[PDB]
């Protein structure tokens, strides 16, 4: 009921239009009972007395009724179709916008296929609470109210007997509906699991093929697929078990009113004809009662899926400080003060990390595999927040500077290069959309990117494949370097930017890069120490701690852990 109140809340901006829908469906309902009445009247007025001179008039009246009834049905559907899709659109909009506010930590831990499922498969399931579901409910409540008034108009005593069988129908609906929601919520969560497998396997098929895991991934899939078939059958059975069960309940009610009706006839209260009349009037009451009860069992599909939709909508999202400041006239005064960090929040990754960088300086961050170099950077980008310590950008705490301004001042070439499925121009234009075609062509020429871009079938307008896999690994990095330089940040981070870029090209760019790097503060993470030896400051890391700090020549003659790293290169 709690989820139902929330889901029904999406109908509030459509209140007036939904009132019209109710007004039109009530007119359609009174016309729906007027139509067989008029057919019954035509037989008794023109056919029985054999005076067919009146027939064209009664036919014209009946024809106008059918013309109005059909036009109202069209009108009901036309406005409801647009009304329902506006609600479904709002729910899809609300989910995507929410994910853009939700922290990065969520995307790494939760499968992407399950999130994709919740946006399409789960939102598509809240359609059986909208459209004709609203029309049938509206028509159901009017027919039920319109029948119950006609029952007491015939016989009050018998009407109490037909109303006393209603709690039994309500009870069996409550048992069935609870089970329907139980198995349907499970069906939608197993669906997300299966959607997660198909999604991950397609994006890594080459690796599955290379290690002949095609069969082992099939049996992995078959475990979840069989689980989906098992709970999906249970949900489908419970969904349509109520209509034949209610026909059994109606028959018990019919037998009870036949006994009660017969009793009243023997007491001189009513006649035999009244019993035959009341069974006709009870049929116009049981029909909407079973229809509304079956509709309650059907809306469990939307209710179970609504839970999965709302689950994403109530996630603790990334929020800025109420008194947060915007960084104006950025220079590059980066500083770390006794910073401690852990991802799992059990075993520490970074331990008392403390260092100061003056504006303009080109600082190098070297260390072994799993030292915590990317962690230092990920904290500066504020993707994660410090356990105990302070990060100061331009002399202001990172928690006090708004995320919008912080990420505008700081640029990053991530360890793992992520490209988009668009033109080479649009991929480079990302970060700084207000960059001229000449500025893009000049920036690509500087990082030796322009050569292979021109060789493509459409040049800069060549549409790239998913993540830009239609290029060499090194060529993808060159595009990532160009995109970051085009963004023109005051603070630039080059975390393993030339991992797959050859030493010949690496030497060629470095010379032209310095001119586009001067007057800007930069943090360069590299395992190719021979490139970062020219840096103003070298921060040597090991086991999440700063062991050595200073210039290349100073650290080499010190014969420390930096010397051991530099010598190991040959």
């Amino acid at each position: 009921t709690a989820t139902l109140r929330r889901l029904l809340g999406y109908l509030r901006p459509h209140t007036f239009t939904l009132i019209m829908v109710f007004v039109f469906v009530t007119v359609s309902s009174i016309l729906g009972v007027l139509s067989p009445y008029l057919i019954g009247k035509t037989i008794a007025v023109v056919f029985v007395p054999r005076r067919f001179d009146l027939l064209p008039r009664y036919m014209l009246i009946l024809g106008t009724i059918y013309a109005l009834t059909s036009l109202l049905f069209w009108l009901q559907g036309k406005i409801m179709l647009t009304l329902s899709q506006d609600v479904v659109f709002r729910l899809r909009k609300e989910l995507f916008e929410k994910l853009q506010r939700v922290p990065v930590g969520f995307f790494d831990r939760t499968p992407h296929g399950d999130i994709i499922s919740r946006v399409i498969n789960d939102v598509d399931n809240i359609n059986n609470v909208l459209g004709n579901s609203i029309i049938q409910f509206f028509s159901g409540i009017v027919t039920l109210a319109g029948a119950v008034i006609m029952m007491f108009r015939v016989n009050v005593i018998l009407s109490l007997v037909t109303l006393s069988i209603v709690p039994l129908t309500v009870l069996i609906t409550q048992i069935v509906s609870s089970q329907t929601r139980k198995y349907f919520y499970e069906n939608q969560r197993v669906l997300g699991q299966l959607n997660g497998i198909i999604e991950e396997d397609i994006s890594g098929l080459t690796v599955i093929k290379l290690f002949t895991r095609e069969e082992k991934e099939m049996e992995k899939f078959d475990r979840v697929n069989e689980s989906l078939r098992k709970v999906g059958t249970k949900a489908q059975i419970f969904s349509g078990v109520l209509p034949p069960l209610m026909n059994m309940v109606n028959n018990l009610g019919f037998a009870l009113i036949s006994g009660f009706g017969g009793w009243l006839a023997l007491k001189d209260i009513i006649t035999v004809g009244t019993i035959a009349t009341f069974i006709g009037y009870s049929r116009q009451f049981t029909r909407p009662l079973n229809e509304l009860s079956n509709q309650f069992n059907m809306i469990q599909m939307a209710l179970a899926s609504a839970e999965r939709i709302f689950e994403i909508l109530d996630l603790e999202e990334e929020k800025d400080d109420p008194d947060a400041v915007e960084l104006r006239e950025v220079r590059g005064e980066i500083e770390f003060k006794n910073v401690w960090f852990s991802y799992d929040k059990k075993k520490p990754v970074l331990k008392d990390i403390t260092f100061h960088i003056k504006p303009g300086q080109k600082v190098a961050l070297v260390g072994p595999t799993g030292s915590g170099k990317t962690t230092i950077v990920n904290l500066l980008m504020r993707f994660y927040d410090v356990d105990r310590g302070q990060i100061l950008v331009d002399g202001i705490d990172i928690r006090k500077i708004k995320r919008s301004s912080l990420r505008s001042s700081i640029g990053i070439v991530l360890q793992d290069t992520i490209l988009f499925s668009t033109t080479v121009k649009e991929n480079l234009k990302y970060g700084n959309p207000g960059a001229t075609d000449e500025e893009i062509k000049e920036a690509a020429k500087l990082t030796h990117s322009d050569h292979f871009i021109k060789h493509l079938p459409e040049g800069y307008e060549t549409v790239l494949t998913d993540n830009g896999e239609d290029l060499s690994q090194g060529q993808r990095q060159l595009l990532a370097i160009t995109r970051a330089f085009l963004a023109n940040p005051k603070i630039l981070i080059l975390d393993a930017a030339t991992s797959n870029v050859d030493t010949k090209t690496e030497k060629s760019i470095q010379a032209a890069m310095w001119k586009l790097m001067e007057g800007k503060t930069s943090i360069i993470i590299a395992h190719r120490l021979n490139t970062i030896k020219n840096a103003d400051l070298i921060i040597v890391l090991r086991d999440g701690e700063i062991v050595e700090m200073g210039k290349h020549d100073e650290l080499i003659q010190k014969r420390g852990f930096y010397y051991e790293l530099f010598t190991s290169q040959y």
Partner: nanobody
Amino acid sequence: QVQLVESGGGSVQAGGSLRLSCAASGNIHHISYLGWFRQAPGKEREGVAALWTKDGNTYYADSVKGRFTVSLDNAKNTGYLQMNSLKPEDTALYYCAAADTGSDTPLWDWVYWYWGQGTQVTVS
């Protein structure tokens, strides 16, 4: 203390006619139902004719239709059943039933019911 006396049952040849009387004596307030049923030497309870005093509608068996006719005398307090063009197929023990409604009966509690005696009607 209401008792029903049955009289008028004898041997009649095929295509003939015979009237049956059902006299009721006691503290009768208002009769609501009057019925007649035939019983074979190896059958439970059947249904031949019925009368409801509120409307006057008569409900007969499928074989009877336009043969037997049920009636009741108000002043005499006696039920009647006229049998016309009798076929040898309806050779059985005929009975009587009468439902009376007394002054001020409870909300859910019913009134009384009274059965006849039984008289043999043989048709060959």
